[PDB]
């Protein structure tokens, strides 16, 4: 699907082809003038004609050089702008695909898509058409001229050309499958490297370098690269030897010296071949080297367009405040593998719902369904009476804020992380939100204060980053709040303080809490026990204790 992707470049590519035909003709003209200059030199022509021919040839060389440079500059600018717009399109597309896409792909796949594929399109959309047109025009024009000059010495030039064509065809056929397999290996190697860098503590405690899957994958990738690049480079060097100007000059002389020594050819008739017969080999080598780039660009275009055609979380146009309602919701991460099974629930303003249950029951996926990271397989989810599929991302996430189970901090200052949902928020608001999350003092202790960066290495403890995400949600200040295992890494004192702050800040708001620590959710207006993806009992703390069900068992296990 590279044609559909590269349709916007329809006119620049045609312009490149025709302008490159003109440029290669202008590049061949100086050598025709030099052949005429040599013919006049042998004839003892007047100095005026020789000066005219030499100056014209030199000026035409300069013109051809400047025109080729300008065309390459313009075409590289075109390619750069196309890559920029395509990367913007890819980022916009990925901004609304389901999160299952990201989970089943990985970060290395996304990096290869946005950056490596767009860069693999470079030769295809910057050099392929110029190289093709140059390698078609210059050999044809030169060979027509030389067959007019002398067919006997022109025929021998087909030997290197036919050998080059055979080498090019066998090289392309041999390397096609390996070029197809190359992006998969690059993606796998990137994923292994990312895991090796991110999972360094696990590598250091368990196995080290020797027993790491990264090293085995590295060895396998190097073996694949050797098996790919050895015959490819051998064919490439043979093609370079065949088309080199020295080879053409030597075969021209081998054909012509026996003719000149006998009374079969005037030596002057060899002036074209020596001056033009050694000009078009490099242009042929350009396409010979560029066939692989064309193949890689075509595969990259196919992958990019496949991702750009991917189904996404489409916003419907169908078109109580602060209410969330799940109605017979079911969900499947994988087809045929249910994880939520006909869940009906209603979170109302001014109430607290505590979603508890066994680990892996489906609490986090239900929270993500409310966030519309995935679309419900069945049922519906409504916010303020509006189905979440009819709401845009802004409309949805201005009404519902989330504190996810994993405390994901972005690379940036702590103020940026707290102000993620509202980057224009003032410093006073950020400080108040941090104080509500019991993290302002820790940020004060930092060297840069609220400007201290939170990249790799300069991390925090688990409870501290969890509190930072809680402060982020507090600063967002949505009518509906979801807290997936918040304060799991918090000590009892910090947990009590942040829970008191949350209760103060969400008295009139809808609140969903997920907690394995059942002692922190006994005050909830509603307690929903989720087991095996379905609700098994609902009630208050005392009612659920009296029921003697799953909640009673979990409570007894907790004491």
């Amino acid at each position: 699907a590279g044609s559909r992707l590269l349709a916007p470049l329809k006119k620049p590519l045609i312009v490149s082809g025709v302008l490159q035909a003109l440029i290669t003709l202008i590049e061949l003209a100086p050598f025709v003038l030099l052949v005429e200059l040599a013919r006049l030199l042998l004839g003892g022509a007047e100095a005026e004609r020789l000066w005219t021919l030499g100056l014209t040839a030199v000026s035409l060389i300069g013109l051809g050089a400047v025109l080729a440079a300008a065309m390459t500059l313009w075409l590289h600018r075109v390619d750069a702008r196309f890559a920029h717009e395509l990367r913007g399109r890819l980022l916009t597309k990925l901004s609304r695909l389901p999160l299952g896409w990201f989970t089943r792909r990985g970060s290395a796949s996304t990096k290869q898509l946005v950056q490596d594929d767009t860069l693999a399109l470079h030769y295809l959309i910057t050099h392929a058409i110029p190289d093709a047109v140059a390698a078609v025009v210059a050999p044809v024009a030169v060979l027509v001229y030389l067959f007019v000059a002398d067919w006997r010495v022109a025929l021998v030039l087909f030997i290197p050309v036919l050998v080059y064509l055979v080498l090019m065809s066998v090289m392309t056929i041999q390397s096609g499958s390996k070029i197809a397999q190359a992006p998969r290996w690059a993606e796998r190697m990137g994923g292994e490297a990312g895991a090796f860098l991110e999972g360094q503590p696990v590598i250091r405690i368990f196995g080290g370098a020797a027993a790491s899957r990264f090293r085995r994958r590295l060895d396998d990738y190097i073996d694949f690269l050797v098996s790919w690049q050895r015959p490819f480079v051998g064919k490439k060097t043979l093609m370079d030897l065949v088309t080199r100007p020295a080879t053409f000059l030597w075969i021209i002389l081998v054909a012509g010296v026996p003719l000149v020594v006998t009374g079969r050819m005037d030596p002057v008739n060899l002036l074209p071949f020596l001056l033009l017969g050694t000009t078009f080999g490099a242009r042929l080598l350009g396409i010979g080297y560029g066939l692989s780039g064309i193949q890689t660009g075509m595969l990259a275009a196919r992958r990019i367009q496949t991702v750009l055609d991917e189904p996404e979380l489409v916003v419907r146009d169908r078109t109580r405040p602060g209410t969330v309602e799940l109605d017979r919701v079911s969900f499947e991460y994988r087809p045929g593998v249910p994880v939520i099974r006909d869940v009906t629930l209603t979170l109302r303003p001014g109430t607290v719902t505590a979603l508890v249950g066994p680990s892996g029951s489906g609490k986090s996926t239900l929270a993500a369904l409310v966030a519309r990271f995935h679309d419900v397989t069945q049922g519906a989810i409504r916010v303020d009476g509006r189905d979440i599929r009819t709401l845009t991302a802004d409309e949805l996430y201005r009404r519902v804020g989330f504190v996810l189970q994993d405390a994901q901090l972005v690379h940036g200052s702590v103020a940026e992380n707290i102000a993620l949902a509202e980057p224009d928020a003032g410093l006073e608001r950020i400080r108040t939100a941090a104080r509500d999350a019991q993290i302002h003092d820790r940020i004060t202790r930092m060297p840069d204060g609220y400007d201290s960066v939170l990249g790799a290495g300069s991390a925090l403890s688990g409870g501290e980053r969890q509190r930072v995400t809680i402060a982020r949600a507090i600063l967002a200040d949505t009518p509906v709040l979801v807290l997936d295992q918040a304060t799991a890494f918090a000590d009892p004192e910090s947990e009590y303080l942040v829970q008191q702050a949350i209760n103060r800040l969400t008295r009139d708001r809808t609140v969903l809490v997920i907690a394995h620590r059942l002692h922190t959710i006994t005050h909830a207006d509603q307690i929903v026990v989720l087991d095996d993806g379905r609700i098994v009992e609902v009630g208050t703390h005392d009612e659920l204790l009296a029921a003697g069900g799953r909640y009673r068992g979990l409570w007894d296990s907790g004491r």
């Binding site: 030199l41 950056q115 690269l225 081998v254 000149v260 892996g360 996430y397 989330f402 790799a456």
Partner: protein
């Protein structure tokens, strides 16, 4: 080239010398073949064209020899490029686990990722694609100028003078776009790191509405990356023009001297015609060098990143080993001080933990109890003081013996992107099936195997993102329990587990048959029931310690901690 020779394997220097000899021989054969045309054409245009047979025979020999020296130079260049690739990647792979954790800043982490990312064919084919044509092109007009001294001394000097401007253009070209190429690399690497952050932090960015390019950090990096790439294209224009002017200046000197000699009569008319062909051969490297100049700069940036990883400071290590084999060691801190940067974490923490006994570390968030576990495991090392395992300082231990001494359950469990069984087998890849099932049964991972459809073949995602928080936590517990190490550091291993799994896991840690010196960190009272001793760590100081019942009766911080 000096950086490349620094990275060549020491047992591959025989091929480098052979490569350098054949590379020069290839250049001389190309130069001699170009200049052999001058005798050949003068003889061919003379009254006895049969005299050109001698010079055609010498052209055939020089042409045949050039083919052999070029196929061999390509074969050796291919071996040198992949030999250099394998060592650098193997060296970085071996060094990185030993690098200090403080080295892994976001810039250094990006450098390491990009250095590893250079395993592709571009760096492997560096010698064949960059050095062989760059050396061949740089030396060919010098070789032609030398070979023309045998034809005419002032002709060769004019040819040689045109090579002084070639190397002048080559030397100055890099400095014209040095800054633009640097900013392009910085914005390109920054864009790479935001894409990975974009995919990893996708859920949190969507809730924050920081996911569209007009509002995302990756979108800002794309705009900066694009602007730097366009600046690079414009700032490379002086470099290409400079090589063009060098070829123009070289043409005038070569052509001007050839015309001057011919008018003087010192050079024949057929010889001057043959010198037009030599002049074209003489000016081809001027254009080839211009094409290779951009490739030379990206290679220099690539090798700097590889050298940055190989220059990373490794942790101190020794050769000592623990005396007993498999026996539970004693863990003691001897006035251990630690600091992240300038901020003090630990301040004179001293204690001793008896062999084969369970100890609990509790306290407020940020007290330093995760840093204590890292010091015991050797992930971090003390600023001062000394952590001792069975009386042996950890910094003096063999790295092989140091990792075999401790198994860790980390606060934030990280699984590798594969099957569930492979992540458990990381603890002991040679473990028998009975040992693997025993570890999974203890960690309550056996519940997952029946619950999930694929069982232990369930393909986990990046990290453990395709599993719930408590499911990947139990997988990291089964990993630690499978390892036969005699020290177990449990860092809040039931944080994401319900009460039923918390109780089963906590009993499982105590019920492990083999002896271990167990250290457990937990924010739950029910997770430290079987601990024989407790350490209350607050602000990097053990405020109190003793038995669980003793500390509750004391009415100190420990009693108030769970109040």
């Amino acid at each position: 080239i000096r950086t490349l020779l620094r990275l060549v394997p020491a047992e591959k220097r025989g091929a480098v010398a052979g490569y350098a000899v054949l590379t020069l021989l290839s250049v001389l054969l190309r130069a001699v073949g170009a200049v052999l045309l001058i005798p050949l054409l003068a003889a061919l245009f003379s009254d006895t064209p049969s005299d050109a047979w001698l010079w055609l025979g010498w052209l055939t020999a020089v042409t045949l020899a050039g083919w052999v020296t070029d196929t061999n130079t390509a074969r050796l260049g291919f071996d040198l490029g992949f030999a250099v690739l394998s060592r650098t990647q193997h060296d970085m792979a071996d060094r990185l686990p030993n690098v200090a954790m403080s080295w892994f800043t976001p810039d250094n982490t990006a450098t390491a990722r990009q250095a590893i990312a250079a395993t592709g064919p571009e760096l492997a084919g560096l010698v064949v694609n960059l050095l062989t044509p760059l050396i061949g092109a740089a030396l060919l007009p010098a070789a032609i100028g030398v070979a023309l001294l045998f034809v005419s001394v002032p002709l060769g000097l004019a040819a040689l003078a045109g090579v002084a401007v070639l190397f002048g253009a080559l030397a100055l070209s890099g400095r014209l776009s040095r800054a633009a190429d640097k900013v392009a690399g910085e914005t390109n690497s920054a864009f790479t790191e935001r894409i990975i952050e974009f995919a990893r932090t996708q859920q949190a960015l969507r809730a924050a509405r920081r996911v569209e390019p007009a509002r995302s950090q990756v979108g800002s990096a794309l705009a900066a990356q694009h602007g730097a790439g366009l600046r690079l294209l414009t700032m490379q224009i002086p470099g290409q023009v400079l090589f063009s002017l060098a070829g123009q200046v070289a043409l005038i000197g070569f052509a001007g001297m050839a015309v001057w000699l011919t008018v003087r009569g010192q050079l024949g008319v057929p010889e001057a015609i043959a010198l037009i062909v030599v002049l074209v051969r003489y000016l081809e490297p001027f254009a080839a060098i211009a094409d290779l100049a951009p490739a030379l700069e990206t290679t220099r940036a690539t090798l700097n990143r590889i050298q940055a990883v190989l220059d990373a400071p490794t942790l101190p290590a020794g050769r000592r080993r623990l005396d007993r084999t498999g026996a539970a060691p004693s863990i003691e801190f001897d006035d251990v001080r630690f600091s992240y940067g300038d901020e003090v974490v630990l301040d004179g923490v001293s204690f001793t933990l008896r062999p084969g006994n369970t100890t609990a570390i509790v306290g407020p968030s940020g007290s330093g109890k995760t840093t204590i576990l890292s010091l015991i495991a050797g992930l971090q090392q003390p600023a001062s003081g000394r952590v001792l395992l069975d009386g042996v300082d950890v910094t003096t231990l063999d790295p092989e013996a140091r990792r075999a001494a401790v198994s860790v359950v980390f606060q934030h469990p990280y699984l590798f992107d594969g099957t569930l069984r492979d992540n458990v087998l990381v603890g002991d890849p040679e473990a028998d099936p009975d040992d693997v099932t025993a570890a999974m049964r203890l960690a309550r991972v056996d519940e997952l195997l029946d619950r999930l459809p694929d069982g232990d073949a369930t393909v986990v995602g990046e990290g453990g993102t395709a599993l719930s928080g408590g499911e990947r936590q139990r997988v990291s517990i089964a990993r630690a329990l499978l390892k036969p190490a005699p020290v177990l550091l449990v860092d809040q291993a039931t944080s994401a587990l319900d009460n039923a799994n918390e109780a089963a896991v906590v009993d499982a840690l105590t019920a492990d048959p083999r002896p271990r010196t167990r250290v457990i960190v937990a924010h739950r009272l029910a997770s430290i029931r079987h601990a024989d001793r407790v350490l209350f760590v607050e602000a990097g100081r053990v405020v109190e310690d003793g038995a669980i019942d003793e500390l509750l009766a004391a009415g100190g911080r420990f009693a108030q901690f769970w109040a």
